[PDB]
């Protein structure tokens, strides 16, 4: 269990980078909504940032966390430098996807998928 | 072995220096370029009068697909699926069963002409000269759906073009 680190030597070092990235994303959302003329609000944008961060909250490997931050920074750079277009930003919200059934009965009626 | 494309010393004698000054001030090499375009103005153009005149093609030309018959009218295809196996684009779809007379024949033979890369591997693979690429290239359509050929369309193509297809195969089959 001896491995080469990416950036952080432990979880505490890794969590510092996570918080720094959250700060950058949090401050960027108002500019993104304006630059891309999004129809979503700033609260919706910041809620989306929180949801994406929360889904990875269970990780305990500092190397995995480093990669998640590395990828999150890349995503932020794409947004700030406006390499993304309006469609790329809005892909986080899945507006044209119909809600998919969650409970057993709804899934049972519509198909065979679990 | 190599050669230099641009390793030359301009002469610095007065006569040569004055040749370059004359070129600079009197635009001689620009005039020369005007001579070339003027000569082309008086050349016969290379344009042909399409669709009354057509570009030349060879018997090997790979155009629209067709399914062929024997002289008796029986289909050549015996549903071996070699064309479907080799197709680099997976453009061919085949189903088969015993025909009412016991023959081994297809019940489905589809070519998605928008998946096809018009490579001719199917006609190379076919062991009985059943699927060929014909000489036709003027079959553009107004809808996507019209380019999803089923077996009836491909057999109709064979019956439509067999006169030309047979002669082209006669011309090239000794190279195969």
């Amino acid at each position: 269990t001896s491995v080469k680190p990416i950036f952080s030597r432990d979880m505490n070092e890794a969590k510092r980078r996570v918080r720094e990235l959250y700060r950058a994303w949090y401050r960027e959302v108002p500019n993104t909504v304006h630059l891309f003329q999004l129809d979503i609000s700033v609260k919706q944008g910041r809620d989306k940032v929180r949801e994406m961060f929360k889904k990875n909250a269970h990780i305990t490997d500092p190397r995995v966390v480093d990669l998640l931050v590395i990828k999150g920074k890349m995503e932020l750079e794409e947004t700030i430098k406006v390499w993304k277009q309006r469609t790329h930003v809005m892909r986080f919200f899945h507006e044209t996807e119909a809600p998919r059934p969650k409970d057993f009965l709804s899934k049972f009626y519509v198909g065979h998928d679990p | 072995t190599y050669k230099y494309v641009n390793l030359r010393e301009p002469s610095m004698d007065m006569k040569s220096v004055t040749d370059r000054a004359a070129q600079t001030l009197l635009w001689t090499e620009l005039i020369r370029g005007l001579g070339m375009t003027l000569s082309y103005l008086f050349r016969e153009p290379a344009t042909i009068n399409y669709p009354f005149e057509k570009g030349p093609l060879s018997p090997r030309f790979r155009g629209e697909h067709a399914l062929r018959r024997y002289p008796s009218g029986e289909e050549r295809c015996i549903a071996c699926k070699l064309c479907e196996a080799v197709c680099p684009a997976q453009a061919i779809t085949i189903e088969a069963e015993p025909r009412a007379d016991g023959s081994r024949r297809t019940t489905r033979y589809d070519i998605d002409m928008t998946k096809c890369i018009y490579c001719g591997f199917c006609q190379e693979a076919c062991p009985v000269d059943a699927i060929v690429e014909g000489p036709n290239f003027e079959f553009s359509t107004e809808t996507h759906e019209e380019l999803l050929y089923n077996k009836e369309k491909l057999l109709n193509n064979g019956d439509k073009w067999e006169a030309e297809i047979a002669a082209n195969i006669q011309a090239d089959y000794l190279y195969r």
Partner: protein, 386 residues
């Protein structure tokens, strides 16, 4: 200020689309950041789901101005792993059409370079020559561009009777067409103002940045894979390698024009030295048998059946095989796992490393020069993006 170049010119252009994000200060270019992948089509992944024969047409569509040369590179790599050898007549045909392909590429490279700089007329003259060469492609393969003609083991079919006479008639007049092109450009002071001392690259930098082909020889490096690592029958033809002295766009343009002349010189020898014989390896476990044999002999039918369904198995191994393609070193890192489908196929496109050097080469130049530098690299985004 920040600026984005347009995807492509407002006239027909066949290089693909590029998103160039640039940083400018006044007229000068300070940073170039090409954003590619606009023609990325996952070719390298698709090949893993194909037999070796099924993957061959993908190479026509990489540098789709140099079709048969890309076919040759892939064929040589598979022949090496197969440990077989194509017959001598096929090798001569491959060199003959390799140089016809070089002419096709250099016409496109030189004339569209000129067309983007504003010199429209030569494109029209020389594309009539390209149209006649498309006819040679069509007469051997039935296709004007994506012939799929050169295959591991040799070529698909022998030349039709009368083709070599027509290639001779074409070649007889082509140098005159080059001369007319040089009359328009070589000594033109406007052309020289757009190219001389533009995009200079040192010999040392060109090597470290991964350059190849004319991008090396323009800087004086004496290197050509047809000379140093010959393949097929290139060791049996005589030709000179043009070498630049200034390492700029003008010298690279002169190198490409002179290479066209040397290609005619090679084609001349190929037309006279063409030997008789079969045109694909006489091993029916690799190359399919003749149709008459397939319809008469039990062994031939089996091998035809198996070669067109499973395909031939290739012994396990990995090779990096490269050729002197018209745009530079074109290679394939081909990994075989012993089956009839390649395990991995990395494609080395010469334009990939050339375009990566656009930022280096454009330093200290103006916006209009960026167009000239892209042209001198001769970039096609099918091979860059794959």
């Amino acid at each position: 200020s920040n600026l984005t170049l347009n995807f492509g010119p407002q006239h027909p252009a066949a290089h693909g689309v590029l998103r160039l994000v640039m940083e400018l200060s006044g007229e000068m270019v300070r940073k170039c950041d090409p954003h590619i992948g606009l023609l990325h089509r996952g070719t390298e992944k698709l090949i893993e789901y194909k037999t070796y024969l099924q993957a061959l047409p993908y190479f026509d569509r990489l540098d789709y101005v140099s079709m048969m040369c890309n076919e040759q590179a892939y064929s040589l790599a598979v022949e090496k792993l197969l440990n077989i050898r194509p017959p001598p007549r096929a090798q001569w045909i491959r060199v003959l059409f390799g140089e016809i392909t070089r002419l096709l590429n250099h016409i496109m490279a030189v004339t569209t370079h000129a067309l983007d700089i504003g010199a429209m007329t030569p494109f029209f003259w020389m594309f009539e020559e390209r149209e006649k060469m498309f006819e040679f492609y069509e007469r051997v393969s039935g296709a004007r561009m994506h012939a799929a003609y050169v295959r591991p083991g040799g070529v698909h079919q022998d030349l039709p009777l009368g083709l070599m006479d027509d290639i001779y008639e074409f070649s007889k007049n082509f140098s005159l067409r080059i001369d007319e092109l040089e009359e328009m450009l070589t000594n033109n002071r406007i052309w020289r103002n757009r190219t001389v001392d533009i995009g200079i690259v040192t010999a040392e930098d060109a090597l470290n940045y991964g350059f190849s082909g004319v991008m090396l020889r323009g800087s004086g490096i004496q290197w050509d894979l047809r000379k140093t690592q010959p393949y097929d029958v290139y060791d049996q033809v005589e030709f000179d390698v043009p070498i630049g002295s200034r390492g700029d766009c003008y010298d690279r343009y002169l190198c490409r024009v002179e290479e066209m002349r040397q290609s005619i010189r090679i084609i001349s020898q190929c037309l006279n030295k063409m030997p008789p014989g079969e045109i694909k390896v006489d091993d029916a476990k690799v190359s399919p048998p003749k149709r008459a044999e397939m319809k008469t002999s039990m062994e031939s039918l089996i091998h035809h059946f198996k070669l067109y369904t499973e395909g031939y198995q290739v012994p396990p191994g990995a090779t990096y095989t490269a050729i002197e393609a018209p745009k530079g070193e074109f290679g394939v890192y081909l990994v075989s796992d012993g089956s009839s489908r390649p395990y991995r196929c990395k494609i080395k496109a010469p334009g990939f490393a050339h375009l990566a050097g656009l930022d280096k080469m454009s330093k200290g130049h103006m916006l209009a020069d960026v167009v000239a530098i892209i042209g001198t690299q001769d970039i096609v985004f099918g091979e860059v993006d794959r």
